[PDB]
């Protein structure tokens with residue numbers, strides 16, 4: 213008993229997908245720079261703000277991947293940053309919002325990308341990777357198994373995507389070489405391959421063209437269960453209302469939403485977008501979620 217109807221519930225949309233499907237096969241929405249939603253100062257906004265609603269809102273609109281950027285403080289906690297900007301959000305804060313969401317919707321999983329976003333503060337006693345793994349990761353809410361992670365094992369857990377070096381604890385997707393401002397393909401673990409389009413800081417026209425190109429490769433490779441396709445629709449700021457990430461997102465999100473509607477693909481990858489909201493139609497995350505219809 214599973215139906216495409218259940219894909220319309222953005223809060224439980226992973227429920228009808230068979231537990232045996234690998235997460236990499238599933239088309240999943242994500243948020244880029246997920247924790248920038250408390251910024252108010254206007255200069256901070258045009259340069260660094262990428263979301264306007266809190267974590268629970270993002271999850272309730274179907275996002276399951278979260279781009280968590282951390283900094284180690286002098287009291288040995290990890291807080292959220294966007295470049296050099298403090299975000300007034302802590303790492304525990306996000307995990308607790310994830311915990312609450314997973315308790316309310318135990319059919320779902322949360323994929324958390326963690327990256328070290330800025331140099332450690334001098335007063336800290338340990339390294340970023342060690343602090344994160346000893347004080348946050350050993351928590352049982354994080355799934356500790358590896359391989360080509362299946363949804364069934366991830367339900368009710370947080371699945372870590374390591375974008376930091378130094379890991380000593382198994383679990384999640386291993387760190388891998390992530391060249392700056394490129395589209396690239398490498399290995400995740402033995403037997404799993406990954407393709408990432410992260411051309412931030414590129415002309416608008418090259419950005420849209422790279423989103424579509426990499427989605428095309430996902431589309432035409434829909435039944436390769438081992439290959440991760442990660443597609444950042446976000447674009448870095450130019451410093452003004454004419455090129456902030458808000459301006460760009462107000463055009464790219466519906467542009468890419470139409471592209472999916474138009475192509476009715478069986479797979480579109482892990483689409484990480486700025487400003488998930490209800491302002492621009494068609495809704496990108498909605499079209500990404502519906503692209504899983506063929507899995508039911």
Ligand SMILES: O[C@H]1[C@H](O)[C@H](O)[C@H](O)[C@@H](O)[C@H]1O
Pocket residue numbers: 392410412448
């Ligand atoms: O400058 C950052 C950084 O280089 C990250 O690696 C990338 O993922 C983008 O978010 C970009 O904004």
